[PDB]
């Protein structure tokens, strides 16, 4: 199984909006840098800050070609506390379903807007994060394969490394499912892992 | 592990933003 270019484009647009929303609802950055916009016929908050925007843009631009060949199991937005321990994780787990489902492309907005709505109200079910949190994004490949690095390593200015245990391990995690969707060609699931005392 | 990739760069911090 492989996705296509456009499915991968769809997913990257989706993830850009999402990452912005997360950084907003979890006050990783202060509200003063955001502006109301509208994606998938619904209200979101997009950062205005050019450096931050370029970071998120760069990140996803690099993931794109691995989505193309369906080589990504998870994209993870990790929130790190002041001492750089992970406090919280937003996981987009991406599967290929093996036909009576909805068409992904015909129904894009209904299908993805559901994720966005859930991110908007998610602080209702998460514990507040401490002050000082930063973020990082992590890509979990299906395989440990050379080609993932070739494909990811497309902006000289914006290189990638393999992560360690430090970047990943969360103590005593609790799980909060947010949204699960199946389609034509794609099964995606968004769920949060938070630390049990933050 | 061997199948987790992550950007070398940190995103711009909260501080670094307070002034732009």
């Amino acid at each position: 199984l492989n996705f296509g270019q456009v499915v991968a484009d769809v997913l990257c647009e989706f993830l850009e909006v999402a990452v912005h929303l997360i950084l907003y609802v979890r006050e990783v950055y202060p509200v003063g840098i955001f502006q109301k916009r509208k994606k998938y016929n619904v209200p979101v908050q997009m950062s205005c800050h050019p450096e931050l925007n370029q970071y998120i843009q760069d990140t996803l631009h690099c993931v794109k070609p691995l989505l193309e060949k369906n080589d990504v199991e998870k994209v993870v937005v990790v929130i790190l506390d002041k001492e750089h321990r992970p406090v919280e994780k937003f996981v987009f787990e991406i599967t290929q379903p093996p036909i009576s489902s909805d068409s992904l492309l015909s129904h894009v907005e209904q299908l993805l807007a559901a994720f966005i709505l859930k991110i908007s109200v998610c602080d209702a079910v998460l514990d507040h994060n401490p002050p000082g949190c930063t973020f990082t994004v992590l890509v979990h490949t299906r395989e440990a394969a050379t080609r993932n690095m070739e494909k990811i390593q497309v902006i000289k200015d914006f290189p990638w490394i393999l992560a360690d245990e430090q970047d990943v391990h969360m103590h005593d995690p609790r799980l909060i499912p947010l949204k699960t969707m199946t389609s034509d060609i794609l099964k995606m699931q968004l769920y949060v892992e938070e630390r049990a005392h933050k | 592990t061997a199948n987790i990739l992550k950007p070398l760069m940190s995103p711009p911090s909260r501080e670094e933003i307070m002034a732009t």
């Binding site: 440990a144 394969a145 050379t146 690095m149 070739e150 390593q153 000289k156 200015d157 290189p159 490394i161 393999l162 360690d164 | 061997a2 070398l8 760069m9």
Partner: protein, 96 residues
């Protein structure tokens, strides 16, 4: 704190690499990737003397090998070390 598969001491890394490139003619990608990682950890730990040694060592063995595969392996590892140096230090390693 930087290790190849447990090998911390420079020479354990040396022997482990040597045996590895000298025994195997089709290396597991998963291993190649650990080498890259090991090298980028050397950069994050500020041990530039060691990566230069390692780089050179595996350049010599990898490129000397008859296998097309080790030659390509080296190229991959070095590429991925170079983009990281070029951003951590503003420079790429000198390779003659």
């Amino acid at each position: 704190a930087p290790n190849l598969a447990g090998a911390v001491e420079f020479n354990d890394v040396k022997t482990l690499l040597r045996e590895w490139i000298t025994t195997i003619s089709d290396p597991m990608e998963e291993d190649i990737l650990q080498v890259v990682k090991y090298c980028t950890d050397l950069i994050e730990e500020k041990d530039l003397e060691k990566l230069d040694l390692v780089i050179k060592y595996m350049k010599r063995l990898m490129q000397q090998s008859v296998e097309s595969v080790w030659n390509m392996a080296f190229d991959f590892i070095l590429d991925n070390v170079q983009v990281v140096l070029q951003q951590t230090y503003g420079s790429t390693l000198k390779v003659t």
